[PDB]
Amino acid sequence: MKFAEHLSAHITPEWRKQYIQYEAFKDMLYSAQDQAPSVEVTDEDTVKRYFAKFEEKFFQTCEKELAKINTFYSEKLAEAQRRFATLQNELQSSLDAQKESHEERVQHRNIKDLKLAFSEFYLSLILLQNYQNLNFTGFRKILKKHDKILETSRGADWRVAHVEVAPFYTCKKINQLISETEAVVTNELEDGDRQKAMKRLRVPPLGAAQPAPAWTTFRVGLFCGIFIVLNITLVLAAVFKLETDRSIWPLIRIYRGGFLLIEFLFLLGINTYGWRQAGVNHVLIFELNPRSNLSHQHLFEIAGFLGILWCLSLLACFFAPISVIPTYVYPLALYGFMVFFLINPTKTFYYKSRFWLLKLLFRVFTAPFHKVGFADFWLADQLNSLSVILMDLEYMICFYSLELKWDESKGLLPNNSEESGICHKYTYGVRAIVQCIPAWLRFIQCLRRYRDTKRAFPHLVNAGKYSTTFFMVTFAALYSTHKERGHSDTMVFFYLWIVFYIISSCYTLIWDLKMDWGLFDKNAGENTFLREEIVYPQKAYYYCAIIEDVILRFAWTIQISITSTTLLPHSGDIIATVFAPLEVFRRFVWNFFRLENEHLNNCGEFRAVRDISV
Amino acid sequence: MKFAEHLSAHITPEWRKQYIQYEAFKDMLYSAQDQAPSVEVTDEDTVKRYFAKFEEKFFQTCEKELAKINTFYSEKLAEAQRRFATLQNELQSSLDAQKESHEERVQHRNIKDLKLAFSEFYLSLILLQNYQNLNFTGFRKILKKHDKILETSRGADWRVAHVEVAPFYTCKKINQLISETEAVVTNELEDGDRQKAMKRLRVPPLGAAQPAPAWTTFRVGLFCGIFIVLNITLVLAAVFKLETDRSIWPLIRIYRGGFLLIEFLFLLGINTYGWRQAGVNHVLIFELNPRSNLSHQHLFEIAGFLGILWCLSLLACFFAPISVIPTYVYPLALYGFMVFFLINPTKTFYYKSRFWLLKLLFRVFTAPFHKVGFADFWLADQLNSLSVILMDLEYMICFYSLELKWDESKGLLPNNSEESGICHKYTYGVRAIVQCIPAWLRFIQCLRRYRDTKRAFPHLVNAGKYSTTFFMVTFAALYSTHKERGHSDTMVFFYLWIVFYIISSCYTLIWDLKMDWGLFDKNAGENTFLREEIVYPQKAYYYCAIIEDVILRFAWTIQISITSTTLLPHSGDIIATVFAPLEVFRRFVWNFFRLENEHLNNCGEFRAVRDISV
Ligand SMILES: O=P(O)(O)O[C@H]1[C@@H](OP(=O)(O)O)[C@H](OP(=O)(O)O)[C@@H](OP(=O)(O)OP(=O)(O)O)[C@H](OP(=O)(O)O)[C@H]1OP(=O)(O)O
Ligand SMILES: O=P(O)(O)O[C@H]1[C@@H](OP(=O)(O)O)[C@H](OP(=O)(O)O)[C@@H](OP(=O)(O)OP(=O)(O)O)[C@H](OP(=O)(O)O)[C@H]1OP(=O)(O)O
Ligand SMILES: O=P(O)(O)O[C@H]1[C@@H](OP(=O)(O)O)[C@H](OP(=O)(O)O)[C@@H](OP(=O)(O)OP(=O)(O)O)[C@H](OP(=O)(O)O)[C@H]1OP(=O)(O)O
Ligand SMILES: O=P(O)(O)O[C@H]1[C@@H](OP(=O)(O)O)[C@H](OP(=O)(O)O)[C@@H](OP(=O)(O)OP(=O)(O)O)[C@H](OP(=O)(O)O)[C@H]1OP(=O)(O)O
């Protein structure tokens, strides 16, 4: 009925330019129909010749499209045949080695990677088959549509004479390859059982708009509604009922991290939805499973549940829920519940994503030794902007270990004490390393990448980009320490520090535009100050992001400076609280164009599957 | 991949017994496969003869199923051809009358009914086409499964030799009929335009019933979450913050009706979901549009919004956030909003259902004159159990017009002695008629039906059933009035009243079982105390409903009698509040089996479309 959006939603992204231009043909046909003058205005010969010339040009365009499709199909078939030959040779070598302990574990890894390579090959073959079917359907539908407006029946004859003889339609090699692959997998690997072998080779409609189950959407809406109502109740309770008898700073300073985490989860769900809709293949970049994947609804549901728990804990800290449990227990219960949810060793509640995240975290935090992929440095980049949660963790540990006297009530709020503040300082040393941890991780990753791929431009400069944070933080700490000690030269520690402000931002900002986002290209074309090809439909997004990155970069250096050095102590807490939720927004904007620039490097290579070895 | 639930969900409910028994064939094949004796000593000849006899019986069953399908298709095709001939003759008569004002309005009505009859005929033809396609697919799939499991080449040969030469597959008369119908509608009726005619004749995937849009489910969940959180907050506020000013009785008596309406909407949504899932075709019975329909999610989304408004109004009444607006304004705003939502004359917010409901309400309340259909008496039956809202309406009108002072913001709470008691007495006697209105409507509908049909068994006994409410209410009112007047003979007005209690319930209860639900049949099989065929899978539902109706009938009788007679001082206002939400539950249970018994009168007639006339 509606072929346009069906074709749009069933297109393989990396081959989007290799399909048929249905919409262009439709617009051309409509323009030709409208351009016809009146019967009386022009003679019948002029109308006849106009129709004839338009038909000729239409058929020339159709011939060009058919030739392009045929060439693409032939190249893909040749590539598939060569890959099959290579895989069969490797499988034969592995099986003859197996026929003739550490050797057993090596073999286990061998048939661990081989059964994945075969699955990837099967996915490629299925994608080629779908491409062929969809292209033929589009040709037939556009010719049928043409054969109605013009009322000249020349499209049916053209289809019968040209498309029906096309090799892209008359060849059966893909089906034979599929059958041989199934036979090889069932015989050599799974040893005679078609059930599990077919189960691991099933291709669900991954290249479509497969809706989520209605229960997931219902849960998302339920959690969102409870969250907004609890938020309104919390705001009213804070405004009306509570009096800040002994400050609420050790309360917001503890509850900031959970709010930041929930906001990050929500924005990540939005990011995933945008990637999926815009046509960016993040599954190939992140090296995920094409058949099993997490949609944005699951992330929204997780964020909603976490927000429900956070709001309930804050409300419990607010009024007087239980008259026997001390009020300094609720944040502990909340964070313990978060940790328990993450590291649950059972097989429930997205058990297939939590383990992947845990292994990724281990690899990230063991940076110098493990090899570096896209996911590792992407997660390290996220942790770079998510350091406020680490700061809150350190502050909460030092507040509970030393400052709060557990024997009274109202443990959390009243910090009424003599030396209240021994934790709101920096002089013992541990306030700068906690903030320099992620920069150190990225610096070490860049060093390892340069060592492996010994090409010193991208990585040594990238490694030097993260080193400016060390200089800035150490100079801020030194200036604050000498100000507290009242040295007459403290002001000089101000001066150079200020330049290490600018040298920081102007560094990273440039790397954000030229290298991370790939803008300001010399082949910009019509798109001014951008690159030649853009995925997202509107340039206003690009211009607004360019505008906002500049502003949000400058108020990242100032937040990390004011917060580690802990200076100007009358508005530092409020400014840090205000500026914390802007860092996540900046990173959320950055992710879009970072992954879009990464994706466009796989569109000139026509790569659609994750190539693997044994 | 999974043909079982596809076949189950794509079956026309009224032709379910005329399809192919796929599950029975699967179970038979599995049992035969499991019953393989043994190679051990049994001997190959015994296994061979067992396989041969099973193959023979399998082929006999397949032949019987094929013959049944062929005969059903032949009968349906003959019926369709005769109906087409009749419709063509009527259309020809109408067009020749049109070719050769009140006559113009009559012609407009004629082409109003004709364009509906043609659409229903087109729906029937499309249903027959789908039946043919699905039956062939099922045959092919089951034969392929048999061939796979029993390692032979008999199934393919049998399919080629028998199913291929079947008329249910080689007869293309339906396609010619469909093309002729399109031609006739496009030429004679829509005058040469295929666009609007085809749009009118399009058959959407009803069987698929594509899982409802995600925004609707999201809104349902959002409204539900807000409702539950507001309910918890309201309960806490009522328990804790309330004040012993003067009574909360003129508040529950006002807010009861909205709660009852919301509960009715929720239970009606559950009812619609149950009807759709169980296979009951309520669209045919209610004479709705087979292409445009309301799902249960829309009713849940209306109910959630109404509950949100109700909870907000109650919270505003409790807290009184605004210090200038009087407290007796909020229920007025709530009920005005409900009325405005119902009678909105624009074209938004389910405008094609509200107008249908309004016309139905007009027909119901003008009962003696209009003809009676299923939708009229069904709605009157619902209003019979929904009289508490009418009682609340009359009480609120009397309370505001007479009692309320409006001068000082004492509001909807209190502060009088006898002003509470003129509205709580029955000197006017108006609270008997407000309760006897729906019984009167049903009684007059039964009288009109008996006059139309001239068959006196069902309708002149139904009218007698409905007439007992008048006796019960009038005797309760007389007893209460004489008790207030202190007559020495008032006790006798008690005595006979008590029998008019029993005579009421034992009447209606019997009509609920034998006639409304069609149970206690004389020719039941293994379903003891039930009817021969049942739609809902489990008999436990039937037995539970049989148990429940008995208790709830006496509860309903005593509740309405006590509420009408205004007797038994304080208890007769908490007992009514407790018993009010049980009469909606009783009606909600009654609807299931009422419509199921109605449905099992077209399944034996093989009627799947609604017949009309011009
Ligand atoms: O005039 P248009 O441009 O609006 O065409 C309409 C419609 O014409 P209409 O006005 O009489 O209803 C066609 O119906 P026909 O009369 O040709 O049969 C319909 O084809 P269809 O029913 O599937 O028939 P088959 O393809 O299965 O053979 C086509 O659907 P697509 O080609 O599949 O996208 C639509 O295209 P669209 O613009 O995308 O909605
Ligand atoms: O070799 P291993 O140690 O990796 O484990 C086997 C397999 O064990 P098995 O031999 O008893 O069938 C695991 O199934 P289980 O024992 O947990 O049921 C399965 O885990 P899984 O499906 O993810 O998890 P679950 O859905 O089953 O809970 C894993 O698949 P991957 O981890 O996805 O690659 C398999 O790898 P492979 O040898 O390539 O088939
Ligand atoms: O052994 P079973 O009883 O489980 O059969 C399975 C499956 O066998 P498997 O174990 O090798 O995967 C069949 O695959 P095959 O090897 O015959 O091709 C499959 O057919 P399929 O792929 O659609 O093939 P085509 O019909 O399109 O030609 C069939 O689907 P349905 O007939 O359409 O319902 C399934 O039936 P089910 O029980 O309902 O899930
Ligand atoms: O004859 P009438 O007075 O009953 O009205 C015509 C038509 O008016 P038209 O002649 O200008 O096209 C109405 O469309 P509008 O004027 O409101 O746009 C349409 O209402 P509708 O589609 O429900 O409502 P909307 O979706 O359009 O808002 C109605 O269809 P039905 O009531 O469903 O039977 C039609 O009946 P028919 O003659 O059989 O085609």
From Swiss-Prot, chains A, B:
Residues 1-211, 280-292, 367-371, 455, 518-536 are cytoplasmic. Changing D516A: Decreases phosphate efflux. Changing T565C: Decreases phosphate efflux. Decreases phosphate efflux. Keywords: Cell membrane, Disease variant, Membrane, Phosphoprotein, Transmembrane, Transmembrane helix. Changing R202E: Increases phosphate efflux. It comes from the Eukaryota. The keyword Cell membrane applies. GO terms for biological process: cellular response to phosphate starvation; intracellular phosphate ion homeostasis; phosphate ion transmembrane transport; phosphate ion transport; response to virus. Pfam families: EXS, SPX. GO terms for molecular function: efflux transmembrane transporter activity; inositol hexakisphosphate binding; phosphate transmembrane transporter activity; virus receptor activity. Changing N602D: In IBGC6; phosphate efflux is impaired; present at the plasma membrane. Changing L128P: In IBGC6; dominant negative; phosphate efflux is impaired; loss of localization to the plasma membrane. Residues 422-614 form the EXS domain. Belongs to the SYG1 (TC 2.A.94) family. This is Solute carrier family 53 member 1. It comes from Homo sapiens (Human). The lineage of its organism: Eukaryota, Metazoa, Chordata, Craniata, Vertebrata.
